[PDB]
Design a protein around this ligand. Structure first.
Ligand SMILES: Nc1nc2c(ncn2[C@@H]2O[C@H](COP(=O)(O)OP(=O)(O)O)[C@@H](O)[C@H]2O)c(=O)[nH]1
Ligand SMILES: [Mg+2]
Length: 396
């Protein structure tokens, strides 16, 4: 029940594909912790956090004009095609588009090779191939020789690529229009997937990743599967930043985000050093109070329950933003009030969190109060995200 073991034991409670950093790195930290040199130990923990936090992801998106590159980029960033910062949908060189909340996630819109006079290899060099983590090759219909050859070149250069077939919703709508209930919409998808794969393999790509989706319905088709696969292919430490940037499409995705964020709080908490003082004994320092307000804003944005996200959703709904906010809890925490009231409010949350969850550590050891409060806000915001998801699905 010693501290070093408790530190690593926390992470061991999460499933493999849900750990924030390699268990191997964590076990070395455990070793250093046992050594007792807090100087070196804190430094090692801070280094782990820095690697996670500093991770930058550069995603290349290529394909013919009109295939849906701009839309795909806006969808993953959670931005409407008509909002600012959004890649303008509609008919040069590459253009970057950073995620609005996670600047370290950058999508690059590349001009389709077909619009250039360059062979696959020259095209990739011109587009600064080595700057990307992976490539997304998009087509709204069938994949032409151009697209396929780029894929082969990328593969030959030892980088990952993914084929994304957009506008599948349009195919289903047009084929099903006026047809009896018996029309098989699922079969349309199954046929397109198999046909694409046969074509890819016929052309020399043995294991072509293919995803059929619609930029107008991120919750359906292969979008969820694509997100899981992209995260799975990334080095462990790079997953956190990309994960928190993803659209909050399912309870599973929301829960996965929470799991990653819980681990970051744990790391951050140990980096600040544990104490022997019970967390609910005193009020908070003003600096910690300000940090918590920033933390709440970040969590709300990550989970899509921030002001801007709420406005965007309820624009045309029968219930406006104020009605939507009334259905959740996080928006009320920091409504304007005096400093005493907010201090008293948080001093109660801390007692309640610890009475329900314990101190998460061996007897007499505690994280500084602010971290238990981050867990409290995280749970609150997570629950709000699920509540809102249900409301979104009923209406859109
Ligand atoms: N129905 C439907 N329309 C889409 C989809 N993706 C893109 N579009 C639309 O098709 C057009 C071309 O898309 P755009 O994203 O600008 O692709 P780009 O020209 O490759 O960058 C726009 O009118 C989009 O609104 C999709 O998955 N489904
Ligand atoms: Mg474009």
């Amino acid at each position: 029940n010693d501290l070093p073991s408790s530190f690593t034991g926390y992470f061991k409670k999460f499933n493999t594909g849900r750990k924030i950093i390699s268990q191997e790195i964590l076990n070395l930290i455990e070793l250093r912790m046992r050594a007792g040199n807090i100087q070196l130990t804190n430094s090692a923990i801070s280094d782990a956090l820095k690697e996670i936090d500093s991770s930058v992801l550069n995603v290349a998106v290529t394909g013919e004009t009109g295939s849906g590159k701009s839309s795909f980029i806006n969808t993953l960033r959670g931005i409407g095609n008509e909002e600012e910062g959004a890649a303008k949908t509609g008919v040069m060189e590459r253009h970057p588009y950073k995620h609005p909340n996670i600047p370290n996630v950058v999508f690059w819109d590349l001009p389709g090779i077909g619009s250039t006079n360059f062979p696959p290899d020259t095209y990739l060099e011109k587009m600064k191939f080595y700057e990307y983590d992976f490539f997304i090759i998009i087509s709204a219909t069938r994949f032409k020789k151009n697209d396929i050859d780029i894929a082969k070149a990328i593969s030959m250069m030892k980088k990952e690529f993914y084929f994304v077939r957009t506008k599948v919703d349009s195919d289903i709508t047009n084929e099903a229009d006026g047809e009896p209930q018996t029309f098989d919409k699922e079969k349309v998808l199954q046929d397109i997937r198999l046909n694409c794969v046969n074509t890819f393999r016929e052309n020399g790509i043995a294991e072509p990743p293919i995803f059929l989706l619609s930029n107008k319905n991120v919750c359906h088709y292969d979008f969820p599967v694509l997100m899981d696969k992209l995260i799975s292919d990334l080095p462990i430490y790079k997953r956190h930043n990309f994960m928190v940037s993803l659209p909050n499409i399912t309870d599973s995705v929301i829960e996965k985000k929470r799991q990653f964020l819980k681990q970051r709080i744990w790391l951050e908490g140990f980096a600040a050093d544990l104490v022997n003082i019970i967390p609910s004994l005193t009020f908070l320092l003003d600096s910690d109070l300000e940090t918590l307000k920033k933390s709440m804003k970040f969590y709300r944005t990550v989970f899509g329950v921030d002001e801007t996200s709420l406005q965007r959703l309820a624009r045309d709904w029968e219930i406006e933003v104020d009605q939507v906010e009334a259905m959740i809890k996080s928006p009320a925490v920091f409504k304007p009030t005096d400093e005493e009231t907010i201090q008293e409010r948080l001093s109660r949350y801390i007692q309640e969190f610890c009475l329900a969850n314990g101190y998460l550590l061996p007897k007499n050891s505690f994280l500084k109060e602010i971290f238990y409060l981050k867990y409290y806000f995280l749970d609150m915001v997570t629950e709000d995200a699920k509540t809102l998801l249900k409301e979104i699905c009923l209406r859109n």
